[PDB]
């Protein structure tokens, strides 16, 4: 009697490994610049200095 | 009266592995630059008159007669 | 002849699947910290100079 037919195909193979982690991101951008003084701030500091050295101004401006 | 046939063909390749996870964030950026200083000329222009008035008023006050 | 044989055994399992694809690139880091503000000292420096100059100019008139 004739031979039988070949079997069914084998089962699907094993699911592959997880892919690797992606590259790290680029460094963030630089921070914002520090603030520069406004005109009004500058005036306010000058007046402070005047007041803080008023004594020295008076000693210098003293008459005989 | 039949011999079993040969084994079947190889199965299909397995399913692809799961996609990888996103990379870590990058490092913090650099510090921003320091704040710009006002020039001497700008300060002199803004405060010249103030200093002069103050000196004027004070000199006047210290020469007063009662 | 006579009866045909039964179906043979299953084939072998196929190869392992390819590995997963590499993940997405990471996001940019966060901004750096802000730079330091300009201090008042550079203003004080000039104010004191101006004050000195003008006090001298005044004193000069003796």
Numbering used by the authors:
A (entry chain A): 3 to 66
B (entry chain C): 2 to 67
C (entry chain B): 2 to 63
Source paper text:
Two host-guest collagen peptides (GPP)4-(GXY)4-(GPP)3, where (GXY)4 sequences are from the α1 and α2 chains of human type I collagen, were recombinantly linked to chains A, B and C (corresponding to α1, α2 and α3 in collagen nomenclature and omitted here to avoid confusion) of the NC2 domain in the following combinations designated as α1Aα1Bα1C (for short 111), α1Aα1Bα2C (112), α1Aα2Bα1C (121), α2Aα1Bα1C (211) and α2Aα2Bα2C (222). Three unique chains form a parallel α-helical right-handed bundle. The most important observation is that the triple-helical chain stagger is entirely determined by the NC2 domain.
All five constructs were screened for crystallization, but only three of them yielded crystals of sufficient quality, crystal structures for 111, 211 and 121 were independently solved using the MAD phasing from selenomethionine derivatives (thereafter designated as 111sm, 211sm and 121sm) to 2.25 Å, 2.10 Å and 1.6 Å, respectively. Whereas the crystal packing for 111sm and 211sm are similar (two trimers per asymmetric unit), it differs from that for 121nat or 121sm (one trimer per asymmetric unit). Namely, a triple helical chain linked to chain B of the NC2 domain is always in the leading position, the one linked to A is in the middle, and the third one linked to C is in the trailing position. We suggest here to use a rule of BAC-translation: chain B is leading, A is middle, C is trailing. This way, construct 121 (or α1Aα2Bα1 C) translates into staggering order of α2α1α1, whereas 211 translates into α1α2α1. Despite the variations of composition (homo-trimeric for 111) and stagger (121 or 211) that might not represent a native stagger, the regions of sequences derived from type I collagen are well structured. Crystal structures of 111, 121 and 211 constructs demonstrated that a staggering order can be manipulated at least for short native collagenous sequences, meaning that such sequences are rather adaptive to various abnormal conformations.
